[PDB]
Design a protein around this ligand. Structure first.
Ligand SMILES: CCCC(CCC)CCN1CCS(=O)(=O)c2c(F)c(F)c(S(N)(=O)=O)c(F)c21
Ligand SMILES: CCCC(CCC)CCN1CCS(=O)(=O)c2c(F)c(F)c(S(N)(=O)=O)c(F)c21
Ligand SMILES: [Zn+2]
Ligand SMILES: [Zn+2]
Lengths: 257, 257
């Protein structure tokens, strides 16, 4: 599966039935489908300050570049959910508008997902994935240089091709989160890639973060979906799914205005 | 095929492979726009239909009005003769169901007047999978003042509430359904927005919307079902629009600057 051409997103459901099922993500966040919910209290981020003396595996699997996260990293306020990995979605150098969620019909430059699984109930994210998952999403805007995101981006020229891995020193993952994390959108949805399992509790923070034009350009030019020896290379660009019908869902907000 | 559940748009490409192919519509029209002085005004000939009768149908996917082949666009390289018109809309809880979007925003609804290349082909079915086959005019609709001309269609909707039902509409001037300043339009090559999704449509989306009243819009959204009258599980005809498609390395040409 890909994001472009005969294996792109309109065809995923041919091999991955859930991609044609209910509760799919991402979605457009707009007024008609939002409702304030005062029960959406703040999440607590536990163990996000990863030791700088430890190192965490960054991998290009051909579809994504993901940073593995330790299971002692958790979110509470929900079961306790343990982190498993983070990754991003982006556009391309000539169109830096590759967020997955949109807000009032507009794409952000990119989007960070921090994937967690219910470690109360399941021994790993793969198991949880068809039960199970909570993903935090941070919208990313073109803006100022972001030293915290650069702790990841500065290693991308070392995982350019599918199957490559690198180590990233620990840092405080909460530095990747925006202002006022108490303010978020919450809804029931799905993985945004195959197998599109409808098993995700989404939290999209209200406020975006910024990374620079130069950071976006590096992100949009550094990576390939294909192996280092593939005679038909494919750039890892435009790796976002279109927004989905909302299938009668509402999105609940922790902010009223 | 449907607009929801497991037979909705992500699954159309199973039976209708072009739905996962190139040149898919609809798209977001955002400032990918390039003025093209070649885009001269169309002339709508034979649109003043003899106050003759024209068949309105509900085929379970759509409510269409059949149009006569002496109605045609002038100004394209070939003559394109009308075949039918129909609309797309959302639902009362989210009344934003145009197919095309403008700067990420949906309009309330959208009218399509479908035509086929009658210089090259004998009917719209034959043309629909052929080069230069189809041309569709799209009118964006927003809620505002009551529109007597659209009521010439909408007054008949109760009589075609269920799949298989038909009503006769006396001829009227179809040009009355077009917006102000039809000289101003967006133009691009795309596809059918329903199965079989053939990439054979020259789209003309007028720049300016029309208005219908809040009551007319609600009637459109509430009058029709996608099921037969005797179906023990009725399904409302709502949200009958396709999500926008990726449109990369491509322009939409505008007749205006
Ligand atoms: C980590 C729990 C879900 C895993 C279970 C097996 C380990 C399958 C899906 N998974 C791994 C394959 S992937 O292609 O690298 C990929 C991806 F690119 C994504 F963007 C998302 S998203 N946006 O979070 O849905 C994924 F969730 C995701
Ligand atoms: C009319 C030339 C194309 C026909 C050829 C066979 C007669 C097949 C498709 N056709 C007929 C089936 S349908 O489901 O009633 C339907 C529809 F609802 C649409 F919204 C559009 S459109 N204009 O793509 O938005 C259609 F074009 C359309
Ligand atoms: Zn993701
Ligand atoms: Zn249509």
């Amino acid at each position: 599966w890909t994001y472009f051409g005969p294996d792109g997103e309109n065809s995923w459901s041919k091999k991955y039935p859930s991609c044609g099922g209910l509760l799919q993500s991402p979605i457009d966040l707009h007024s008609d489908i939002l409702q304030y919910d005062a029960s959406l209290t703040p999440l607590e981020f536990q163990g996000y300050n990863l030791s700088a003396n430890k190192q965490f595996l960054l991998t290009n699997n051909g579809h994504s570049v993901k940073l593995n996260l330790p299971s002692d990293m958790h979110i509470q306020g929900l079961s306790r959910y343990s982190a498993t990995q983070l990754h991003l979605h982006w556009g391309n150098p000539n169109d830096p508008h590759g967020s997955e969620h949109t807000v009032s019909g507009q794409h952000f430059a990119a989007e960070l997902h921090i994937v967690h699984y219910n470690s109360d109930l399941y021994p790993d994210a793969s198991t949880a994935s068809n039960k199970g998952l909570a993903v935090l999403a941070v919208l990313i805007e073109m803006g100022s240089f972001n030293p915290s995101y650069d702790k990841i981006f500065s290693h991308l020229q070392h995982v350019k091709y599918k199957g490559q891995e690198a180590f990233v020193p620990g840092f405080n993952i909460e530095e990747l989160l925006p202002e006022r994390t108490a303010e978020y959108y919450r809804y029931r949805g799905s993985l945004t890639t195959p197998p599109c399992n409808p098993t995700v509790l989404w939290t999209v923070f209200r406020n975006p973060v910024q990374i620079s034009q130069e950071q976006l350009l590096a992100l949009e030019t550094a990576l390939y979906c294909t192996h280092m020896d593939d005679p038909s290379p494919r750039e890892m660009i435009n790796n976002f799914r279109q927004v989905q019908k909302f299938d009668e869902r509402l999105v609940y907000t922790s902010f009223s205005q």
